[PDB]
Amino acid sequence: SMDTFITRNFQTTIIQKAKNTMAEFSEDPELQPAMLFNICVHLEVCYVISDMNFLDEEGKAYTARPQYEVIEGMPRTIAWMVQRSLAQEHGIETPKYLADLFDYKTKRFIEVGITKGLADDYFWKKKEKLGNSMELMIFSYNQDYSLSNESSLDEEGKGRVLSRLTELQAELSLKNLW
Amino acid sequence: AMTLAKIELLKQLLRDNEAKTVLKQTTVDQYNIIRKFNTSRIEKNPSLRMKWAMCSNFPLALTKGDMANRIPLEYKGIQLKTNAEDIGTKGQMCSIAAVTWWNTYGPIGDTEGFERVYESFFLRKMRLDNATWGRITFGPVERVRKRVLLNPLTKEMPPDEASNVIMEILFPKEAGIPRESTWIHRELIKEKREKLKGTMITPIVLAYMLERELVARRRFLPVAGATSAEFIEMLHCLQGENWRQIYHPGGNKLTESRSQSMIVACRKIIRRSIVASNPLELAVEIANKTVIDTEPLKSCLAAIDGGDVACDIIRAALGLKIRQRQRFGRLELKRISGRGFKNDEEILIGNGTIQKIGIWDGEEEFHVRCGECRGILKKSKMKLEKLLINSAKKEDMRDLIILCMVFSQDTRMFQGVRGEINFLNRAGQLLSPMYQLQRYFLNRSNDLFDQWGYEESPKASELHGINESMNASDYTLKGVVVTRNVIDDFSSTETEKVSITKNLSLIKRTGEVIMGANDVSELESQAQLMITYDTPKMWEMGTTKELVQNTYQWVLKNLVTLKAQFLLGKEDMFQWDAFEAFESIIPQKMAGQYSGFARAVLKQMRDQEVMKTDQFIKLLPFCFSPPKLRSNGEPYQFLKLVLKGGGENFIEVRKGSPLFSYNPQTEVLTICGRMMSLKGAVLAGFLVSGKYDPDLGDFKTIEELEKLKPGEKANILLYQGKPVKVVKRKSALSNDISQGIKRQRMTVESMGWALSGWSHP
Amino acid sequence: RKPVGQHSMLEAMAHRLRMDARLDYESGRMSKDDFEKAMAHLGEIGYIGSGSGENLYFQ
């Protein structure tokens, strides 16, 4: 029963919004734990990337107006209102699909990716559906990662994600659910 | 660095519009197609073409480069190479002499490491030089056409595994996935890495030369006697159809090394696991934590495709294929036709008892083997319609005929039973009906052959019949035939997945069973590679002295635990698993007495006195068995404690003995001739940034990790198959994530505020 | 190792040669000047690799 594993490891707020996401796709949560788990991870990682990365009042990155803005984990009715308002404020074209994160320093939209195996291979299967609209961020459970050169994710945050992913990968393989 | 030079060349290809559309349209998948693309015609008869071209002027083709230009145009009136540039490459060609000139007058190259690159070939020369050559013998040899390994390996693996090893050696960045049962050859990888470092030979070759000494080259050959690679390589010289030749190799012991140990290791895991209840659960928990030399047993059983029976049983328990074959005691069977329904029935047998047997129904055929003799079987419902065998050892020719008559379930077999047949195994359990009949007819063979009857021999040139005495005759046993023609080897190429029972029997997916626990061989031998059993239960299958070792060694390790339970004063501390094995060397007649004595002495040290460390260790192993006291109620008392074997094997209670002695002034504890002195949070720095990177060096331990500065990289080997890059800290997750949400809830509330048409600040 | 990928050969070589330079700057094989050279040179290769006809030479 993975429903318990999710309730132990993920926080209350992560789960509620992960279900709210599946409610707008018109799908049943409790009869498909497989999908809900990834949505919680995907949702968790999207926060993690933001969390610590601040920007100071002029325009530089440090650790402690944040550097990123979180889209994933909101209602569609608002998310699109947000995304559209960001694109027209900073003066770039509005993406055709709904993005996950938005960079304030780079003024770019971001799509986060969680994979099991090769980060490089999953990267390319995003390229085929996104061309070069958004900055991709691929993280894998087994310690792989693919990122852009122009992206502004420091060694600190990359750790937070990859460590948490493997921490869940170990807790899955320990109790046989991987 | 090369990096930038690649980009410049790529841009220079994108100038040409044809090459642009190649790289744009053609896929990474299709790379494998376009590399083989050529114009030309593949010309028949290359040997004809070679002789023709070699006689011509300029048959060779030459690669352009700085090294090509150091070859001159002429040399003493001889044309080496040609100018005539082809417009495509702007390139050149040359003649046979051009190569010969290079080997004579050309430049020196860095041929350092060449020996270590082609090591697999150089080991063949090492075998030939040091090998002593024995006597020659002219005589007819029967050559068995067996499946055999052609070339000896450094470490046997499958292609799937060896590739991911080869990758982490030569191409560590591109390797990709960090696999479980792949890295753990870190000894071999780190060894190959440093050996193949200074050389500058083409990687594609290095990979091929690694593959030659890590992948099995197994073909069928006519073989007799030895079945080991270091012999097989020389087979052309070792034997022919009508002669023989003795040979003793370089003598470093390979191939057989793991094959022999793996057999014994598995067999001995079985013998221990059979007895106690739930053999499967023990066979697993043991085999998981067993070791051969350095490799865990999992990877050995999986990689090597040999084994006997116990190997395949242990394989199945852990979870890998074994081989599509069927075994019955000593008999081997491969299904060649037919399929049967094992169907329960009540059966009367000859002696006059009702056994509940399953009856194989339906037409069937089988390729069958036993020992040195091989043959073919045909049976039906409780009837052996036909059997064939080959001229071989009479001991095994007999056993084969018997065991076929058993599994054929012929009514003539069942009627030939005389006397009771209550046979047991090692653990003291009732053998199932047919496994019982097996050992009866192997023992009492003559009772069967009389009941069987005789018929005419088949008059075909290369055949003859046999009788009770296993000799040539014009009479023959009803069904059985012998042939002059020699038969194929065992032969079982394909592999299959299998499930396992509580009693270590292997079940095929259909419902029937193929490999039973009872089918193993009793024959024992010693392990060539050094086995190590980290589990406690298997200490039993050491010797007397080495068990006293491993027990007292376990007490020294877990002193803090045992000494804490001592203060509490309960009877659970005496019932540890380690002391259950120690009872195997105490004679049964005396065990409980020693325990009653030992418990009384350790009780006395708790109540009336203070702690005495050496005696507490000395006496604790004897306390396992239930306390057998005197008739009046008080305990027995002793001076010395005798163990199995006798002579030197005894523990003195008072002070010193050979097995055990403590010197109180210097405080030195001698255990079987081994001295042992008795004098007396960081996992938060666990941020995973990348993967195994050679730049950071060797795998650093805990001590050095504390001294690293905040915000710096390092290599760590974490747990169960994880070689990963790590960074030092520089909050703790849970509070961070909630704060990220509060910033999102901020954004949301303003956008709702906006939907009505307001703002926050 | 026969490589696998549905995407384009060029498209990959661009993405790979990017990261090689990224790593070679951090580890200390290439300088800022040689790195921004590559990122610029590659930048072009991107625009070249997403056209539909001419190479669009310039003056």
CATH number at residue A120: 3.40.91.90
Contacts of B588 (CB under 8 A, 6+ apart): none
Residues of C in contact with B17 (CB under 8 A): 55
Determine if residue A128 is labeled as part of a ligand binding site: no
Residue of B219, B221, B257 lying closest to B238 (CA atoms)? B221
How far apart CA A19 and CA B576 sit, in angstroms, is 49
What are the start-end ranges of the H helices in B224-309?
229-232, 235-238, 256-275, 279-288, 297-303
Q: Do B132 and B234 touch, CB atoms closer than 8 A?
A: no
A149 shares contact with chain C (CB less than 8 Å): yes
* DSSP at B387: E
> How many Cβ pairs within 8 Å bridge chains A and B?
83
Determine if residue A111 is labeled as part of a ligand binding site: yes
Phi, psi values for residue B167, rounded to 5°: -60, -50
Strand runs (DSSP E) across B398-528, as ranges?
A: 454-456, 463-466, 472-473, 475-477, 480-483, 499-500, 506-507, 513-515
SS3 (DSSP) at A37: helix
Query: Considering Cα of B590, then B593, then B599, then B602, what sign does the dihedral take?
Result: negative
The DSSP H or E segment spanning B23 is helix B17-25
Q: Do B480 and B401 touch, CB atoms closer than 8 A?
A: yes
Q: Within 13 Å, how many C-alpha atoms sit on residue B549's CB side?
A: 10
Phi, psi values for residue B244, rounded to 5°: -140, 170
Q: Name which of A124, A127, A149 is nearest C39 (Cβ-Cβ).
A: A149
How far apart CA B390 and CA B487 sit, in angstroms, is 7
Q: Do B408 and B391 touch, CB atoms closer than 8 A?
A: no
What are the start-end ranges of the H helices in B463-558?
544-557
Q: How far is CA B507 from CA A4, B324, B357, B496, B513, in A?
A: 35, 12, 18, 11, 4
Domain span including residue A34: 2-178
Q: Name which of C1, C34, C45 is nearest B4 (Cβ-Cβ).
A: C34
What are the start-end ranges of the H helices in B73-171?
96-105, 114-117, 119-130, 159-170
Breaks (C-N over 2.5 A) in chain A follow: 64
Q: How many CB atoms lie within 10 A of CB A105?
A: 13
Give me the torsion for CA of B339, B342, B348, B349, rounded to 10°.
60
Q: Do A55 and A65 touch, CB atoms closer than 8 A?
A: yes
- Cβ separation A160–B733 shorter than 8 A: yes
How far apart CA A32 and CA A22 sit, in angstroms, is 10
Find how far residue B406's CA is from the centre of its chain: 33
* Tokens 């595994």 -> residue: B161
State which amino acid sits at residue B610: V
State the total domains in chain A: 1
SS3 (DSSP) at B273: helix
End-to-end CA distance of chain A: 13
How far apart CA B510 and CA B340 sit, in angstroms, is 11
* Tokens 């009856």 -> residue: B359
What one-character-per-residue DSSP string does A104-160 give? TTTTEEEEEEEESS-HHHHHHHHHHHHTTSSEEEEEETTS-EE--SS----HHHHHH
How far apart CA A94 and CA A79 sit, in angstroms, is 13
The DSSP H or E segment spanning B13 is helix B3-15
Residues of C in contact with A132 (CB under 8 A): 50
What one-character-per-residue DSSP string does B621-673 give? GGG-S-----SSSSPP--SEEE-SS-SS-EEESSS--SSEEEETTTTEEEESS
Given the DSSP bridges, would you call strands B91-94 and B60-62 parallel, antiparallel or unpaired? antiparallel
Determine if residue A51 is labeled as part of a ligand binding site: no
How far apart CA B265 and CA B534 sit, in angstroms, is 13
Phi, psi values for residue B220, rounded to 5°: -90, 140
Structure token pair of residue B401 = 């005929």
Q: Do B158 and B303 touch, CB atoms closer than 8 A?
A: yes
B683 to chain C, minimum CA–CA distance in Å?
27
How far apart CA A141 and CA A70 sit, in angstroms, is 22
Q: Do A136 and A113 touch, CB atoms closer than 8 A?
A: yes
Residue among C15, C20, C41, C47 with most chain A CBs within 10 A, to mutate: C15
Determine if residue A30 is labeled as part of a ligand binding site: no
Determine if residue A161 is labeled as part of a ligand binding site: no
Contacts of B537 (CB under 8 A, 6+ apart): B272, B282, B286, B577, B580, B581
Q: Do B636 and B593 touch, CB atoms closer than 8 A?
A: yes
Q: Within 13 Å, how many C-alpha atoms sit on residue B384's CB side?
A: 25
Phi, psi values for residue B172, rounded to 5°: -65, -25
Residue of B40, B41, B59 lying closest to B50 (CA atoms)? B59
SS3 (DSSP) at B270: helix
Which residues share a beta bridge with B477? B454
* Tokens 């040091």 -> residue: B130
What are the start-end ranges of the H helices in B131-255?
159-170, 180-183, 186-195, 203-212, 229-232, 235-238
Q: How many CB atoms lie within 10 A of CB A36?
A: 23
How far apart CA C37 and CA B7 sit, in angstroms, is 10
Contacts of C34 (CB under 8 A, 6+ apart): B1, B4
* Tokens 């055709």 -> residue: A96
SS3 (DSSP) at B260: helix
Structure token pair of residue B333 = 């069977």
Q: Do B576 and B582 touch, CB atoms closer than 8 A?
A: no
How far apart CA B397 and CA B389 sit, in angstroms, is 7
Q: Do B741 and B750 touch, CB atoms closer than 8 A?
A: no
- Cβ separation B171–C1 shorter than 8 A: yes
Angle, vertex CA B139, rays to CA B138 and CA B142, nearest 5 = 140
Longest dimension (CA), chain A: 50
A124 shares contact with chain C (CB less than 8 Å): yes
Q: Do B211 and B156 touch, CB atoms closer than 8 A?
A: no
Q: Do B75 and B83 touch, CB atoms closer than 8 A?
A: no
Structural Rg of chain B based on CA atoms: 36
Given the DSSP bridges, would you call strands A108-115 and A135-140 parallel, antiparallel or unpaired? parallel
- Cβ separation B7–C30 shorter than 8 A: no
Given the DSSP bridges, would you call strands B480-483 and B383-390 parallel, antiparallel or unpaired? parallel
Angle, vertex CA A167, rays to CA A161 and CA A171, nearest 5 = 145
Q: How many CB atoms lie within 10 A of CB B30?
A: 15
Q: Do B6 and C44 touch, CB atoms closer than 8 A?
A: no
* Tokens 């029972």 -> residue: B501
What one-character-per-residue DSSP string does A110-122 give? EEEEEESS-HHHH
Residue of B94, B92, B82, B96 lying closest to B54 (CA atoms)? B96
Find how far residue B572's CA is from the centre of its chain: 39
* Tokens 């190799």 -> residue: B249
What one-character-per-residue DSSP string does A52-100 give? H-EE-SSS-EE---BSEEE-SSS-HHHHHHHHHHHHHHHT-PPPSSPPS
- Cβ separation C6–B3 shorter than 8 A: no
Q: How was this structure determined?
A: X-ray
Subunits next to B (3 or more Cβ pairs <8 Å) are A, C
What burial class does residue B123 get, using C-beta atoms within 10 Å of its C-beta: 0-12 exposed, 13-18 middle, 19+ buried?
A: middle
Length of chain B equals 761
Structure token pair of residue B227 = 């079945």
Q: Do B437 and B402 touch, CB atoms closer than 8 A?
A: no
* DSSP at B458: P
How far apart CA B108 and CA B295 sit, in angstroms, is 43
Given the DSSP bridges, would you call strands A135-140 and A145-146 parallel, antiparallel or unpaired? antiparallel
* DSSP at B79: B
Query: Considering Cα of B170, then B171, then B175, then B179, what sign does the dihedral take?
Result: positive
How far apart CA B113 and CA B119 sit, in angstroms, is 10
Q: Within 13 Å, how many C-alpha atoms sit on residue B58's CB side?
A: 13
Residues of C in contact with B22 (CB under 8 A): 9
What one-character-per-residue DSSP string does C4-49 give? --SSBHHHHHHHHHHHHHHHHHHHTSS-HHHHHHHHHHHHHHHHHT
Q: How many CB atoms lie within 10 A of CB C36?
A: 14
How far apart CA A113 and CA B386 sit, in angstroms, is 66
Structure token pair of residue B458 = 């088949």
How far apart CA B431 and CA B421 sit, in angstroms, is 10
Q: How many CB atoms lie within 10 A of CB B716?
A: 20
SS3 (DSSP) at B93: strand
Which residues of C lie inside 8 Å of B (Cβ-Cβ)?
1-10, 12-14, 17, 20-21, 24, 27, 29-30, 34, 37-38, 41-42, 44-45, 48-49, 55
Q: How far is CA B34 from CA B14, B26, B213, B567, C4, in A?
A: 18, 8, 30, 78, 14
Query: Considering Cα of B277, then B279, then B280, then B283, what sign does the dihedral take?
Result: positive
Q: Name which of A127, A132, A149 is nearest C7 (Cβ-Cβ).
A: A127
Q: How far is CA A26 from CA A20, A21, B166, B441, B613, in A?
A: 10, 9, 48, 70, 70
Q: Name which of B7, B14, B28 is nearest C38 (Cβ-Cβ).
A: B7
How far apart CA A33 and CA A31 sit, in angstroms, is 6
State which amino acid sits at residue C21: A
